[PDB]
Amino acid sequence: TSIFLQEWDIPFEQLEIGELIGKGRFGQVYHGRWGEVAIRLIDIERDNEDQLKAFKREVMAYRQTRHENVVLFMGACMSPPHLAIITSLCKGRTLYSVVRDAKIVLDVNKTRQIAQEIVKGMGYLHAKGILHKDLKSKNVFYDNGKVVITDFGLFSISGVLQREDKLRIQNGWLCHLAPEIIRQLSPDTEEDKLPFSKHSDVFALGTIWYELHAREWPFKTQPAEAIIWQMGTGMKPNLSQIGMGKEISDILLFCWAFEQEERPTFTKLMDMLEKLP
Amino acid sequence: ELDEQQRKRLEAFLTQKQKVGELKDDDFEKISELVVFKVSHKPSGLVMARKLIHLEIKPAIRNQIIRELQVLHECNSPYIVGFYGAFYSDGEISICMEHMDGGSLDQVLKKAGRIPEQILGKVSIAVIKGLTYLREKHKIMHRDVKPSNILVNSRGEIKLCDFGVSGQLIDSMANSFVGTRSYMSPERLQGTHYSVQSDIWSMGLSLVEMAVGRYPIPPPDAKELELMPMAIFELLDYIVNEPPPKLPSAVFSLEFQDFVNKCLIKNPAERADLKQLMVHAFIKRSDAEEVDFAGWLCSTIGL
Ligand SMILES: Cc1c(=O)n(C)c(Nc2ccc(I)cc2F)c2c(=O)n(C3CC3)c(=O)n(-c3cccc(NC(=O)CCOCCOCCNC(=O)CCC4=[N+]5C(=Cc6ccc(-c7ccc[nH]7)n6[B-]5(F)F)C=C4)c3)c12
Ligand SMILES: Nc1ncnc2c1ncn2[C@@H]1O[C@H](COP(=O)(O)OP(=O)(O)NP(=O)(O)O)[C@@H](O)[C@H]1O
Ligand SMILES: Nc1ncnc2c1ncn2[C@@H]1O[C@H](COP(=O)(O)OP(=O)(O)NP(=O)(O)O)[C@@H](O)[C@H]1O
Numbered sequence A: 001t002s003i004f005l006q007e008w009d010i011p012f013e014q015l016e017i018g019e020l021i022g023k024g025r026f027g028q029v030y031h032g033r034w035g036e037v038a039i040r041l042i043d044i045e046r047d048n049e050d051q052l053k054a055f056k057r058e059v060m061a062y063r064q065t066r067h068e069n070v071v072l073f074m075g076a077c078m079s080p081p082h083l084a085i086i087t088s089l090c091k092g093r094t095l096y097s098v099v100r101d102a103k104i105v106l107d108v109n110k111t112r113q114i115a116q117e118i119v120k121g122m123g124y125l126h127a128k129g130i131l132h133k134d135l136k137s138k139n140v141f142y143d144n145g146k147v148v149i150t151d152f153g154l155f156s157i158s159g160v161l162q163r164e165d166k167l168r169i170q171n172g173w174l175c176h177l178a179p180e181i182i183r184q185l186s187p188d189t190e191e192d193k194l195p196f197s198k199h200s201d202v203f204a205l206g207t208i209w210y211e212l213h214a215r216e217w218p219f220k221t222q223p224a225e226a227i228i229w230q231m232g233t234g235m236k237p238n239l240s241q242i243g244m245g246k247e248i249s250d251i252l253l254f255c256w257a258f259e260q261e262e263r264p265t266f267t268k269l270m271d272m273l274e275k276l277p
Numbered sequence B: 001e002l003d004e005q006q007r008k009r010l011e012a013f014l015t016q017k018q019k020v021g022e023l024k025d026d027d028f029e030k031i032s033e034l035v036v037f038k039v040s041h042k043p044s045g046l047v048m049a050r051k052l053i054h055l056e057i058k059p060a061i062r063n064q065i066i067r068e069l070q071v072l073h074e075c076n077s078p079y080i081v082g083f084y085g086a087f088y089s090d091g092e093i094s095i096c097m098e099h100m101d102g103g104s105l106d107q108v109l110k111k112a113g114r115i116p117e118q119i120l121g122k123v124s125i126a127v128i129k130g131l132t133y134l135r136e137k138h139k140i141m142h143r144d145v146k147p148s149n150i151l152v153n154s155r156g157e158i159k160l161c162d163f164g165v166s167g168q169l170i171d172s173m174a175n176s177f178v179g180t181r182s183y184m185s186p187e188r189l190q191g192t193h194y195s196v197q198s199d200i201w202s203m204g205l206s207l208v209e210m211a212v213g214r215y216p217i218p219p220p221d222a223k224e225l226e227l228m229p230m231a232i233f234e235l236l237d238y239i240v241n242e243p244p245p246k247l248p249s250a251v252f253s254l255e256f257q258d259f260v261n262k263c264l265i266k267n268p269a270e271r272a273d274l275k276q277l278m279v280h281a282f283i284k285r286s287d288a289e290e291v292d293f294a295g296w297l298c299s300t301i302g303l
Helices: A049-062 A095-099 A108-127 A198-214 A224-232 A246-255 A266-274 B005-018 B059-068 B105-111 B117-137 B167-172 B197-212 B222-227 B232-241 B254-263 B281-287 B293-301
Strands: A016-022 A028-033 A036-043 A073-075 A082-088 A140-143 A146-149 A166-170 B028-033 B036-041 B047-054 B083-089 B092-098 B150-152 B158-160 B175-179
Touching (some): A108 A198, A198 A246, A198 A266, A224 B232, B028 B047, B059 B083, B105 B150, B105 B197, B105 B293, B117 B150, B117 B197, B117 B254, B117 B281, B117 B293, B197 B254, B254 B281
Antiparallel strands (some): A036 A082, A073 A082, A140 A146, A166 B175, B028 B036, B036 B047, B047 B092, B150 B158
């Protein structure tokens, strides 16, 4: 019914909480000290034992992860209604904020590398039976060549969807969602019951690959209802309008493929990215 | 394209804005919830409606925003709700406008059962002449016509609201709501180029919802029309690929049935444009009608 912080293999004497690092839809994220760390406090209902035992199911998994492209899960203390999740703190900027900084060169060799890092990290989490369910550039960190994935598995237990007969959709979410998912969004949809897969996670990498070259998200102009219909029926942009060759544009066709089984594993995708000029 | 009973009320509104000057949070006292609130300005004995959109962005953008919402000072019509000022406060831009005591047509339809054809004839002129104003005198299209944004009052005016003037506020809003009732034209859903024809369709589909008393997609079977569980993507794919909705043959005049049928054509070139609808039999007939709109309003709403 509870999780204590001494249950972890990271030796924990004292934990300090600093300023708020940023606004976010899911709990709050503070600076912390332990070295420096990132504390995400989240709130639950006092007695919803069915979602809390579902959460312990998650974090036991993360206790086993260690990999240089995955944020370091350090600990997680659960005494309801307050919960925390403690990962190491990422020096540097989000890939989101780097893609959008004019002062930053993003050459086709360097984007091929930043994509390979995410793929490695993502192969590792798949290897261990962990879907991310919210892969995106705001949940990848970049600092002078080191590339770290964060926030994996959080979406299951998240509640970022929560008006009456009206689903809240945030800008940028829908263009990461493979069609098998898009076709199912309702005002009754719950994050714990959407059909995520290793395939939907590869789709979301496609959206980052587009974003790495376009330096903006796909479907930037269009309204949300438009995006749902276009994407449910299979309509995907390409990168010829900005002068990207056949091979940079062949990545997208494989990752964004309409039938899941046609999308590669992360292993296969790592091979395809090695073969670029 | 000009009346004088209408010319008095606009000259009466242009004087009520001289009274306000500039605006800030502490000027306003919350009366009731309507997100929008009906609020009581204290520096001016004028009950406004304030809408509060939450935005969180750096200052060079919030000023680029307010500059573009200054355009609504210039636009003024008896078929457009009145704009007073637009200011930023506490991480939320606030638009204060004319308050309208009858509400939107989707809540009067919520309380009434269905709206009788004669009243719907007037509103179409409101809407028809409303949108034609902004295309001809401001080169803007509405971009969000639906029942929730058509406003009525005990004095008997009907006007539009909530339209696409500021292209940067479009961009700065962070998240959108999607539900079971969509009013988006099939050409917008498919991502192709679009004009005021989208608003005409959005008007057509709004008119058949108000005349039937039920959002008309998916169309009801014979069991539900006699007495008179779906995912977003199958509603939107219905709108693009199935034949458009249509009024029930029996209970509505042939002029009306055609009027919506011409709005709900799928190919936006064949759809009726703004002033084809100005000369349609159905609105020539309702124009030269005497309906006491304020009377039907105050009687069924209770004010
Ligand atoms: C925008 C909006 C807003 O301003 N205010 C001020 C709002 N408040 C408000 C307003 C009035 C009053 I009294 C009271 C109020 F409270 C709202 C607002 O309250 N609420 C509700 C409550 C929450 C809103 O929901 N929204 C809002 C409304 C509508 C739409 C949206 N979202 C979207 O549409 C999302 C999809 O992204 C659209 C991106 O499109 C950007 C515009 N890009 C173009 O058009 C390019 C077209 C084009 N052209 C080309 C060439 C030429 C040549 C000539 C012309 C031309 C045509 C016409 C003139 N020249 N063109 B070419 F067409 F430019 C080539 C291409 C959100 C509000
Ligand atoms: N390990 C970390 N190190 C440093 N900053 C972090 C870390 N994890 C999250 N943050 C930041 O904390 C804030 C909140 O994180 P998060 O709630 O994931 O927001 P987000 O994932 O960027 N956007 P969203 O999920 O759509 O709400 C953001 O400013 C993040 O960049
Ligand atoms: N000027 C107004 N006077 C009175 N009621 C209003 C006014 N503007 C909006 N409302 C009501 O406020 C509620 C919300 O309006 P609105 O902000 O337009 O959101 P919405 O109707 O749910 N859809 P949307 O307009 O796109 O945001 C509805 O019940 C409207 O009838």
